[PDB]
Amino acid sequence: KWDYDLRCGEYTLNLNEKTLIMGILNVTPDSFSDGGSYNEVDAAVRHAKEMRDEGAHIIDIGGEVSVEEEIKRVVPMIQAVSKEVKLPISIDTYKAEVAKQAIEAGAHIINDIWGAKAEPKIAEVAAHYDVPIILMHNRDNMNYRNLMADMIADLYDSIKIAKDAGVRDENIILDPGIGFAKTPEQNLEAMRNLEQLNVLGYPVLLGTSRKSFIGHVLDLPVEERLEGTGATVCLGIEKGCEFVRVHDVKEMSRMAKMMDAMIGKG
Amino acid sequence: KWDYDLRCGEYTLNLNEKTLIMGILNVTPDSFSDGGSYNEVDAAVRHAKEMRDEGAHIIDIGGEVSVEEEIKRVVPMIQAVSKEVKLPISIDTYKAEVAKQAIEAGAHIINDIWGAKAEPKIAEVAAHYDVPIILMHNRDNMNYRNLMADMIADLYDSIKIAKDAGVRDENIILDPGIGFAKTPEQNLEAMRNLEQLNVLGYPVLLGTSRKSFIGHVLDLPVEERLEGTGATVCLGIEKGCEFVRVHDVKEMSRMAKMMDAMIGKG
Numbered sequence: 358k359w360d361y362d363l364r365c366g367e368y369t370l371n372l373n374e375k376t377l378i379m380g381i382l383n384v385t386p387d388s389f390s391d392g393g394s395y396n397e398v399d400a401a402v403r404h405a406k407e408m409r410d411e412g413a414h415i416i417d418i419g420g421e422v423s424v425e426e427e428i429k430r431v432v433p434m435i436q437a438v439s440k441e442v443k444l445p446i447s448i449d450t451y452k453a454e455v456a457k458q459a460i461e462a463g464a465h466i467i468n469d470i471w472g473a474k475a476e477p478k479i480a481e482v483a484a485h486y487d488v489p490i491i492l493m494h495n496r497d498n499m500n501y502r503n504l505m506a507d508m509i510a511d512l513y514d515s516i517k518i519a520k521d522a523g524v525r526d527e528n529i530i531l532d533p534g535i536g537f538a539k540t541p542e543q544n545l546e547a548m549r550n551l552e553q554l555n556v557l558g559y560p561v562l563l564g565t566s567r568k569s570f571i572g573h574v575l576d577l578p579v580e581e582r583l584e585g586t587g588a589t590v591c592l593g594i595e596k597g598c599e600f601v602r603v604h605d606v607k608e609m610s611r612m613a614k615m616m617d618a619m620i621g622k623g
Numbered sequence: 624k625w626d627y628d629l630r631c632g633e634y635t636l637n638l639n640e641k642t643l644i645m646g647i648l649n650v651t652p653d654s655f656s657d658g659g660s661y662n663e664v665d666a667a668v669r670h671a672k673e674m675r676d677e678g679a680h681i682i683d684i685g686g687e688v689s690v691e692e693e694i695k696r697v698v699p700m701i702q703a704v705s706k707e708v709k710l711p712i713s714i715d716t717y718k719a720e721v722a723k724q725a726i727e728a729g730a731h732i733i734n735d736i737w738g739a740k741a742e743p744k745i746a747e748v749a750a751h752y753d754v755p756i757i758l759m760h761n762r763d764n765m766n767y768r769n770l771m772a773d774m775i776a777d778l779y780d781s782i783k784i785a786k787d788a789g790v791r792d793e794n795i796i797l798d799p800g801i802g803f804a805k806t807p808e809q810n811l812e813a814m815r816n817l818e819q820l821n822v823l824g825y826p827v828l829l830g831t832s833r834k835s836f837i838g839h840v841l842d843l844p845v846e847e848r849l850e851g852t853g854a855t856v857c858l859g860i861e862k863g864c865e866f867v868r869v870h871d872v873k874e875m876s877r878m879a880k881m882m883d884a885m886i887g888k889g
């Protein structure tokens with residue numbers, strides 16, 4: 358199906374072998390420093406190692422409240438994790454300056470929850486360093502005419518912005534942005550029709566881990582949503598996503614591996 | 624989709640509302656009695672109550688090594704669970720005599736892992752008491768020409784046997800019999816093509832809980848197969864099964880409920 362591998366730098370990710378697991382890194386900050394402290398960075402490195410050991414294929418590191426200090430927080434973490442954990446790293450920001458810094462520090466993938474709409478300059482950064490970028494569907498409103506058709510239009514608006522900056526098709530990944538700009542019922546609708554994103558011809562990453570719509574369905578708090586997240590990950594993979602962004606790496610990695618075997622992946 | 628409810632006796636089960644959960648009852652027998660003892664029956668009642676509280680919609684009670692004493696073991700359990708747990712009960716046997724007894728004792732559904740091929744008389748019992756019967760795919764060999772097409776042929780051979788005895792279409796349920804007469808790779812194939820069973824027009828029940836093919840994929844022992852079973856339950860429901868037969872009721876009931884919401888069931 359995919360005639361190219363995801364090229365990340367020192368690491369390369371096969372898209373046909375298996376559903377690739379993106380581990381979400383804890384960011385419990387130090388109430389005492391501007392960022393960089395030992396307790397903060399060591400908990401971060403510790404979490405990455407655990408996630409690596411539980412089957413994560415990528416570590417996702419997020420800083421999100423001002424620009425200049427977002428770098429201070431996230432830069433020291435990328436430096437330590439990239440050094441001590443042999444996995445590609447993605448920076449969860451939508452800020453151009455931030456992204457530059459993070460790749461500078463050793464991040465391999467950009468993760469923009471605004472799909473280059475918040476700060477289009479980020480796309481230039483992406484093209485510049487030749488890294489893969491994740492373009493999530495988002496918008497500042499919920500007034501959809503046709504949810505799915507609008508998501509695809511919105512997404513395509515991100516691709517245009519990215520290609521116009523020189524981003525290669527092979528370094529583009531899409532995300533339906535579940536839990537963003539969508540009502541609980543709209544979140545279910547996107548899930549139910551996720552396979553439509555495939556027509557755009559790009560690897561799709563899904564991120565539904567522990568989110569409120571799972572809560573709204575099950576009536577369960579964030580810590581009780583492991584079975585709910587599992588359902589959305591299974592249905593996601595059946596509908597053709599290549600990546601999942603989860604908190605419970607051990608559990609999700611197991612279901613993902615079983616789905617893969619069943620649906621003939623790899 | 625289904626224009627009739629599953630009529631069980633005092634209980635009636637809706638097929639359109641939700642994926643219905645079948646709890647597998649523990650049968651740890653008393654090494655000291657022929658059957659009926661307090662420790663054996665009380666653990667049984669206790670397990671049923673827990674499963675009811677965890678969201679089970681049916682309790683499945685199995686005796687399986689001789690005919691005359693299978694009744695001794697399973698009859699006292701049906702009597703106590705039917706009295707103390709307000710849920711329909713299914714008897715997991717393939718033996719005509721056994722089935723008669725169990726419904727006599729209060730069981731509402733028959734669960735035949737040989738699909739009326741081991742003892743066709745069971746079908747007569749089913750028609751006689753007007754109870755729903757589950758016809759599982761099975762055979763004494765693994766020499767398939769075309770797995771799916773043979774399963775459907777084999778299954779249809781069970782339906783013929785059942786209808787010929789007077790069983791009404793509405794009291795017929797099918798099961799692909801995962802883990803029976805199939806290699807691990809064939810178990811994955813049946814899973815991958817489960818939606819084909821739908822053309823026969825009968826509610827389908829899937830039973831994959833903790834089975835060896837999950838083990839063969841994950842390389843994990845029976846007690847470590849909760850995420851693996853979860854994958855097969857999610858994919859099952861997406862492919863249109865109306866029932867699942869699981870051990871981990873709390874967990875499976877949660878994923879099933881989330882799938883239901885996502886795929887527009889209910």
Ligand SMILES: C=C1CN=c2nc(N)[nH]c(=O)c2=N1
Nearest residue numbers: 449470491493532535564565
């Ligand atoms: C809460 C968050 C933060 N960053 C994300 N990034 C991506 N790509 N997808 C998500 O669902 C997502 N959720």
Ligand SMILES: C=C1CN=c2nc(N)[nH]c(=O)c2=N1
Nearest residue numbers: 715736757759798801830831
């Ligand atoms: C191990 C067992 C015993 N009885 C069963 N009964 C049904 N209907 N389906 C199964 O998968 C099944 N597995």
